[PDB]
Amino acid sequence: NTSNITFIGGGNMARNIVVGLIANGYDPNRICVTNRSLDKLDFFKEKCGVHTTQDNRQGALNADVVVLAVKPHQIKMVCEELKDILSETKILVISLAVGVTTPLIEKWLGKASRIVRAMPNTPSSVRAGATGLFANETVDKDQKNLAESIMRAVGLVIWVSSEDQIEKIAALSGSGPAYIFLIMEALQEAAEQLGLTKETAELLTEQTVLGAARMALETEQSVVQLRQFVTSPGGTTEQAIKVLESGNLRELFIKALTAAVNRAKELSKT
Amino acid sequence: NTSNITFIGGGNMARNIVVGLIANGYDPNRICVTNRSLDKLDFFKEKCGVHTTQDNRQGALNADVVVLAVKPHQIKMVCEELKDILSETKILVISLAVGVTTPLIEKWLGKASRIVRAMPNTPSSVRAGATGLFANETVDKDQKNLAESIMRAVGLVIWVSSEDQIEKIAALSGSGPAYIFLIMEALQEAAEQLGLTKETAELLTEQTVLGAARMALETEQSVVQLRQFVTSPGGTTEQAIKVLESGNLRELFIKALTAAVNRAKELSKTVD
Numbered sequence A: 001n002t003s004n005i006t007f008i009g010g011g012n013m014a015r016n017i018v019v020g021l022i023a024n025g026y027d028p029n030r031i032c033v034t035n036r037s038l039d040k041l042d043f044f045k046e047k048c049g050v051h052t053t054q055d056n057r058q059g060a061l062n063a064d065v066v067v068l069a070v071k072p073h074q075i076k077m078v079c080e081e082l083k084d085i086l087s088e089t090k091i092l093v094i095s096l097a098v099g100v101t102t103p104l105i106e107k108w109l110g111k112a113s114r115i116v117r118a119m120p121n122t123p124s125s126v127r128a129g130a131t132g133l134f135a136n137e138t139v140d141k142d143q144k145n146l147a148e149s150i151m152r153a154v155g156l157v158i159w160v161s162s163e164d165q166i167e168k169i170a171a172l173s174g175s176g177p178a179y180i181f182l183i184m185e186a187l188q189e190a191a192e193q194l195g196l197t198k199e200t201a202e203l204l205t206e207q208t209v210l211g212a213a214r215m216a217l218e219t220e221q222s223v224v225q226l227r228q229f230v231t232s233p234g235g236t237t238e239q240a241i242k243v244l245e246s247g248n249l250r251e252l253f254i255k256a257l258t259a260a261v262n263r264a265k266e267l268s269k270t
Numbered sequence B: 001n002t003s004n005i006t007f008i009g010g011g012n013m014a015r016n017i018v019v020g021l022i023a024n025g026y027d028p029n030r031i032c033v034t035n036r037s038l039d040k041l042d043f044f045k046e047k048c049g050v051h052t053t054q055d056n057r058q059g060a061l062n063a064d065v066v067v068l069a070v071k072p073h074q075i076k077m078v079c080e081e082l083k084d085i086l087s088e089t090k091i092l093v094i095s096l097a098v099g100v101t102t103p104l105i106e107k108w109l110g111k112a113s114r115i116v117r118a119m120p121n122t123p124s125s126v127r128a129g130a131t132g133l134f135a136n137e138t139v140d141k142d143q144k145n146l147a148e149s150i151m152r153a154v155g156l157v158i159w160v161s162s163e164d165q166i167e168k169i170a171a172l173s174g175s176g177p178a179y180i181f182l183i184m185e186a187l188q189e190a191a192e193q194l195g196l197t198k199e200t201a202e203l204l205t206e207q208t209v210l211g212a213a214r215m216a217l218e219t220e221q222s223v224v225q226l227r228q229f230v231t232s233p234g235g236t237t238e239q240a241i242k243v244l245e246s247g248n249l250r251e252l253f254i255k256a257l258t259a260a261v262n263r264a265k266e267l268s269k270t271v272d
Ligand SMILES: NC(=O)c1ccc[n+]([C@@H]2O[C@H](COP(=O)([O-])OP(=O)(O)OC[C@H]3O[C@@H](n4cnc5c(N)ncnc54)[C@H](OP(=O)(O)O)[C@@H]3O)[C@@H](O)[C@H]2O)c1
Pocket: A008, A009, A010, A011, A012, A013, A014, A034, A035, A036, A037, A038, A040, A056, A068, A069, A070, A071, A072, A073, A074, A077, A078, A096, A097, A098, A119, A120, A121, A122
């Protein structure tokens, strides 16, 4: 190892990843955060103890990895600002910009630009993010482990062979938390419909969701098999489940993710 | 962490508490699991390294705490089978059974001061469980602290003022993990329908659910407010939400929890 990582933009996602790295003992001297405004840089400067600058070029100078963490409308401007610094350099660029495809990023940066596109989600802010990654052709294996490692600082990381699967990631893990929020609400309010106080129902619902997710993660069993541990033949759970299967949830979700992916394609910048 | 704990029955709930306790550092030597059939005991003996025995009375013998982890319609006999051994000492008895009210247990055992009802769930295995606890006023504070110390080791604890609250908690967090497992199944198979691999769909689904609960748990913001914060207008997420909102999920879950409670109320007429 020996990687200088520069984050262009000092926003929420950059902060997520930087704090994740710092917390895992990543050398703070090997990190640079550039931001347009000074306020945000105070945090990175004082608390994180990483390098800060308001000059993207200075910031990117000598970096092995440049992470593009600016809002999507600023992505072309920052690229054009760094095209000369990053030209024929073998430097890895990680794009966090939603919707922005790699070929489009290549147009701005050069043709042999080494690009990884990340699709992280909101739970990144609580160190439980799910990130889908797509790697350019130019990206060498070392850089793929590097990209994966950096994004693992905020949660788990998967790869897709084709960049068109990113929109499917966005629809699943990108928009997924919202789905769970909706679910938790419905479940919460059902519990409250019975004689459970709002506070108890809220807490139990969240712990229940947390626990089922933890179990699924740390266990070999499928979610089907884990469901069996909960269900006794002719038991209470089985009756509640029969009702949930009444609602045709697989199909409900298929339409939901389809709507999401369709929208993602329309919003996709190429 | 010093009590001798004997689980009567070694099924799913027993297995998950025990796995949870061991994971928390609980001395395997202080735990005993019994079960009418032999095969289930193998896991406890070989994976957990805890005492196993096919004989309820032998397991209960030295226990400082006895956890009844048999079906609700098997609680009565188990209580009669052990009535004397339990009453003979201040052995704390924790019933996990749904639809077995303390009054019935007080009858089974002829005593009513060492009875705590606990409504745990399977994520206890990973120490991320949720357990409703109930105990009548006849149960002193140190017995209640004991039960709590034990259930707290595998996850959150919530004491409730009435027993029907426990049965409500049973339909929420007791059966809850199954609901989540079902949603996760539906979600990841939907993701596979769109063309993602099984492994990726499973992993992202799992992690997505975890992340959502985490965000929920780490803020005082409601789930609704988090949903808004996460949904931009005209965006990808909003499209999916609009589909989901038409699934009438609030009503689906209300209908589902109630059907769990009514079924619980059916079993309770049966446990005597
Ligand atoms: N949906 C998601 O959770 C997801 C996940 C990961 C990444 N992303 C993408 O990653 C990007 C970051 O999002 P975010 O919410 O973390 O950001 P944010 O907090 O809303 O703002 C990003 C930061 O970039 C800075 N910036 C803007 N123009 C700049 C420039 N020309 N040079 C240097 N810095 C500049 C801004 O600084 P000031 O405004 O303070 O001056 C701002 O603080 C977005 O494009 C987003 O789409 C999305």
